[PDB]
Subunit: 145 residues, 3 copies
């Protein structure tokens, strides 16, 4: 996946970011079986005060996670995945769950690419990896924590 | 909703950003009936020259509103709301309508989280607010302008 | 279309950004027939190290392109468009393809707005353009490279 994580500048240190990225990568990997290296977590920082709720300028605690997935998973699974992102990001970032927003968007995997290659179905995988080139697998492999 | 508003650095003063978040919120509240505090407006500033139109580097006037919505509203209502954002952001930003881009993407409510709580179906916002705990209600209410 | 291009700060020179913008814009025009000026490319820069892959902090080479399209085109055409973006952005940015991530999200053209006006369906740009007002046509024509 790609997780776009919109946060305010400075609210997360480099170690909070890694912590926030590990909590999200673990949830997605744990609940969908997708391998570690296929989860991209992309932090988008903006100055505090660029977030408004009900037209009221916010401080710098709001966290919005926009997850871009392949279609084909159940509402159950997606429900569990989002709840675990709320819980586990709350822990990692040391924020109150009342600051955490999470939207999952789904596209067909036919029109999705990571590492220059078209993704599998969630009902494939493994064999998509083993069908990649060895230099391709190798570069992917350096991306596991 | 979550409205990501892509503007150029310093195109919108702090005062201009507040009036724009206010316009967007008031349009979405007035046309869908969701409470103000559920309306998030997240400004994404980037230096001028990061927008290209047909390969022509642009100055800092272009505004892209990306609206993230729950599924279930008519094409009619979505039409009216998009037009009202164009007009109302134009006044609030004092910007000709020709610079304004607005896209609405929709996702099932069951995979969408708001203040750490899953959203109801559209039209069911009052029963879902009443169901919230007292501290959660009070906290949301602070976010109303 | 709107192409949000996520890259680390200073990874792209101002001329490489033009070349990536041109590469995407000519890909989209070539295969969809949409006029040059309807292609928006919006660079979203972040400091290097805000991207994680499998929990591993990255340098500034990763490029994620999130294309936002109208519904109505075939899986096959979107496959060719995605592959072409990978190939030609690779060239224009001097970045190996394996750093490049491409996702296409689709929406009904009835809830999408370019230059203050609603898009037509994916067959009817010419007649849509011809029926615009003469100042709008003139403004759109300026954004062609």
């Amino acid at each position: 996946p790609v997780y776009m994580v919109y946060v305010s500048q400075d609210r997360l240190t480099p170690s909070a970011k890694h912590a926030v990225a590990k909590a999200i990568t673990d949830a997605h990997r744990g609940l969908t079986g997708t391998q570690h290296f296929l989860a991209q977590v992309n932090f988008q920082e903006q100055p505090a005060g660029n977030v408004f709720l009900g037209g009221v300028q916010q401080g710098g605690d709001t966290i919005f996670v926009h997850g871009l997935h392949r279609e084909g998973r159940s509402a159950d699974l997606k429900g569990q995945l989002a709840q675990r992102i709320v819980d586990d990001v709350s822990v990692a970032a040391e924020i109150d769950r009342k600051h955490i927003w999470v939207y999952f968007g789904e596209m067909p995997a036919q029109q999705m690419v990571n590492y220059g290659r078209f993704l599998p179905q969630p009902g494939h995988e493994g064999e998509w990896f083993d069908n990649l080139s060895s230099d391709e697998r190798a570069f992917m492999e350096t991306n596991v924590d």
